[PDB]
């Protein structure tokens, strides 16, 4: 019977609200009260990448940490060397409506997509010398949200149809399909160890899904407006999300519920991009009040402004290193900073 | 100095990668970018093939000008999520049909085709992407709306309105109602033009539409306005 | 990827003749090119180089004023105008491709080449070895000496390896002197420390069998070396 489908239902909700509160004995606000403040923190814009004639979108970092992936509304992906400002590659989108660029962590492939519902896989190390397209993985029925790279033949992809799926990169083909989530799903970040992942959606929820299992196996709601930005802890433990409703929380696992949140009462922007640092001890998000905000972590203090963009901050990355913050934004310009 | 040889070269290609993008860009502000909208059988399809997946984009030179219409009535999706990637169009093709004020949709029947796609209208001529961003507001299946007009009443519709059964008064008053829903009429403006399938003047329309708006362009840029 | 070059013959001494080289399979606009000489018993002597969009020509010494070097990229070929020839010029000409960005690969393809019969302050790489006996699965360790230190500020050390098998153009095995080329086995590997460099081959097949030069890649003034020979 549906009402007693939606009765157990309920009372499936009321018994995981109450492990949880069972589960929470001392938030992490007071476990967190006597560790030293991380202090103001200054950075400068070291670099200015220029070039993109539109707004950026997306920006994925290289596991080099120097090469740097822009995915802008001009159509074009430019692989910048942000030692040396110089445009490796200029990829001429089919579409230029991407909203996600990733990196794969062996640098030969560069994916983008966006409203043409295509993740766009790129090979970079060809013979004939000019970038071209690998491969173009179809079937998602909404935008392309986020894209990251399992490895050279695995790619995670979230569209807005409410669904992420795992392809493989020779045969085009959707492995594995997630599904669970009502809303648009905006955001991804693969695990440090690769085994899970994390995606936030417009229902205001993350849900924590299995690769090699396909089904989600934790889901954690704390949120009030749509989760744009999800970044997963270099622990690979717990993870951040970012929302409309202008507040970042961190999510653990272990826990099932949400530790501390990231509010102040000047912020009304929403959260576009998150990205933690490499001890994880500094949160890094980027608002639609045209800044960028340096979190601490374990403490719900602001540590410090990456202010600088004419425009709204869009995308976000921290190198695998830990030298470098780029904060690619709609003023076409991208800064790197440290 | 201090680079080498190789560093050199590698400076220029990303130099000539910078020539490439600066000519790419020149060439895509030359360019007219506009959003095609409508509510589901409003004749946005009979329109693009008239100017001749989640997005379709139809690329058409008229009088000179290459245009760029992008149809994004089959993402089926959360509007607001992709939305701002159109801010900075040149204008927004809106397609309602005329012959939707009899019609309802399949579910809730309570409520009226036309009144959906009032209400579209109203969430993106007064979205906050969409400031100066003017309309080019198009009224097709307009011999559609004759026949039924000729039967049935314009009352079903909107009961507020009391003129002639005739084709110019309740055309008159259909493009006013869409008007007014214009809550900024100071920084934007709303083409509102009838059309059907035999019509050869819609490219025209739009060519002279988008002109203007090009004008108007030129004039905030200039400080004029 | 194939790079065919023509012209070629018989030539008076002081004449002139035209060298072209047509490219086909890659991008030939977005590779930079190079011209690299074989006199009939000796080693490889840069001679010319093209870049990109023509914005950079660089000539060698030997060859400065003399010959002018240009492109068609439309036509996807490579031209090498000869003037006023002498016996020095006496070579099998390479037409090299050479593409430069970050963690690029240069001197990848070698064409077949064209020989060219005349009848009657830069860094310089030595490499003393000169002939070894080698077997198969053995280990050698070819060894390659500059003039100066070819690590540069930025980290990259310039030492470029070839291999020159009998009869045919050379390939490019280390770019960098740490970097593997593109298709070349494992066994290959390359060690220095800025002015002496080593090529280390782990395992020895019939293959491996040829002439071994080092290049540098600081002063575009490129040098190679005298070509250490490895025979069966």
């Known amino acids: 019977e549906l009402d007693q489908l939606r009765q157990e239902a309920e009372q499936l909700k009321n018994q995981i609200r109450d492990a949880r509160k069972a589960c929470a004995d001392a938030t992490l606000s007071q476990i967190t009260n006597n560790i030293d403040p991380v202090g103001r923190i200054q950075m400068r814009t070291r670099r200015t990448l220029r070039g993109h004639l539109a707004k950026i979108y997306a920006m994925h970092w290289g596991t080099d940490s120097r090469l740097l992936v822009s995915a802008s509304q001009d159509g074009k992906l430019i692989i910048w060397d942000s030692y040396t400002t110089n445009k490796v590659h200029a990829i001429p989108l089919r579409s230029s409506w991407v909203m996600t660029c990733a990196y794969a962590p062996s640098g030969n492939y560069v994916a983008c997509g966006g409203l043409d519902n295509i993740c766009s896989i790129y090979n970079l190390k060809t013979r004939e010398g000019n970038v071209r397209v690998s491969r173009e993985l179809a079937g998602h029925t909404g935008y392309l949200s986020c894209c990251r790279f399992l490895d050279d033949n695995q790619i995670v992809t979230s569209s807005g149809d409410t669904t992420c799926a795992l392809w493989d990169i020779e045969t085009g083909q959707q492995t594995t399909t997630f599904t669970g989530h009502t809303g648009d799903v905006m955001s991804l970040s693969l695990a440090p160890d690769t085994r899970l992942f994390v995606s936030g959606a417009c229902d205001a929820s993350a849900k924590l899904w299995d690769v090699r299992e396909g089904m989600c196996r934790q889901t954690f709601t704390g949120h009030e407006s749509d989760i744009n930005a999800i970044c997963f802890f270099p622990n690979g433990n717990a993870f951040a999300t970012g929302s409309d409703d202008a507040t970042c929380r961190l999510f653990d696992l272990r826990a099932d519920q949400e530790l501390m949140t990231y509010s102040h009462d000047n912020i009304i922007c929403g959260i576009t991009s998150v990205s933690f640092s490499k001890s994880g001890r500094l949160l890094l998000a980027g608002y639609d009040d045209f800044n960028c905000n340096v979190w601490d972590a374990l403490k719900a203090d602001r540590a410090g402004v990456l202010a600088g963009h004419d425009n709204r901050v869009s995308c976000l990355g921290v190198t695998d290193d830990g030298m470098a913050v780029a904060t690619g934004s709609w003023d076409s310009f991208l800064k790197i900073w440290n | 100095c201090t680079l080498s040889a190789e560093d050199k070269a590698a400076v220029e290609r990303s130099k000539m990668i910078d020539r490439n993008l600066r000519e790419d860009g020149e060439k895509a502000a030359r360019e007219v970018k506009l959003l095609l909208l409508g509510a589901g059988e409003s004749g946005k399809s009979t329109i693009v093939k008239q100017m001749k997946t989640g997005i379709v984009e139809t690329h058409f030179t008229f009088k000179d000008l290459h245009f760029k219409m992008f149809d994004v009535g089959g993402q089926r999706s959360e509007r607001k999520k992709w939305i701002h990637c159109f801010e900075g169009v040149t204008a927004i093709i809106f397609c309602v049909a005329l012959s939707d004020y009899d019609l309802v949709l399949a579910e809730d029947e309570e409520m009226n085709r036309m009144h959906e796609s009032m209400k579209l209208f109203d969430s993106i001529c007064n979205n906050k992407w969409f400031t100066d961003t003017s309309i080019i507001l198009f009224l097709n299946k307009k011999d559609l709306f004759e026949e039924k007009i000729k039967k049935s009443p314009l009352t079903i519709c909107y009961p507020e309105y009391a003129g002639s059964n005739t084709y110019e008064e309740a055309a008159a008053y259909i493009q006013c109602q869409f008007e007014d829903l214009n809550k900024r009429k100071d920084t934007k403006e709303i083409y509102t033009h009838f059309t059907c399938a035999t019509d050869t003047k819609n490219v025209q329309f739009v060519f002279d539409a988008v002109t203007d708006v090009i004008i108007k362009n030129n004039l905030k840029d200039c400080g004029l306005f | 990827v194939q790079l065919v070059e023509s012209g070629g013959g018989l030539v008076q001494p002081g004449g002139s003749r035209k060298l072209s080289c047509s490219a086909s399979?890659?991008?030939?606009?977005?590779?930079?090119m190079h011209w690299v000489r074989q006199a009939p018993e000796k080693g490889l002597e840069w001679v010319a180089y093209?870049?990109?969009?023509?914005?950079?020509?660089y000539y060698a010494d030997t060859v400065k004023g003399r010959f002018t070097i240009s492109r068609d990229d439309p036509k996807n070929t490579l031209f090498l105008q000869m003037t006023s020839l002498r016996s020095e010029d006496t070579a099998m000409y390479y037409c090299?491709?050479?593409?430069?960005?970050?963690?690029?690969?240069?001197?990848?393809?070698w064409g077949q080449g064209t020989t060219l019969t005349v009848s009657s302050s830069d860094i310089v790489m030595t490499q003393a070895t000169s002939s070894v006996p080698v077997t198969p699965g053995e280990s050698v360790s070819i060894s390659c000496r500059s003039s100066?230190?070819?690590?540069?500020?930025?980290?990259?050390?310039?030492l470029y390896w070839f291999l020159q098998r009998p009869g045919q153009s050379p390939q490019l095995l280390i770019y960098?002197?740490?970097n593997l080329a593109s298709g070349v086995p494992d066994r290959f590997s390359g060690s220095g420390s800025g002015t002496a460099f080593t090529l280390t081959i782990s395992r020895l097949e019939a293959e491996d069998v040829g002439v071994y030069y080092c290049?540098?890649?600081?002063?575009?003034?490129?040098?190679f070396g005298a070509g250490t020979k490895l025979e069966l």
């Open positions: 090299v491709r050479s593409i430069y960005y970050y963690g690029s690969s240069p001197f990848d393809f």
């Open positions: 399979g890659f991008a030939f606009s977005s590779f930079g």
């Open positions: 093209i870049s990109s969009g023509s914005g950079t020509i």
């Open positions: 100066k230190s070819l690590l540069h500020s930025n980290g990259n050390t310039y």
């Open positions: 960098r002197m740490s």
């Open positions: 290049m540098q890649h600081l002063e575009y003034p490129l040098t």
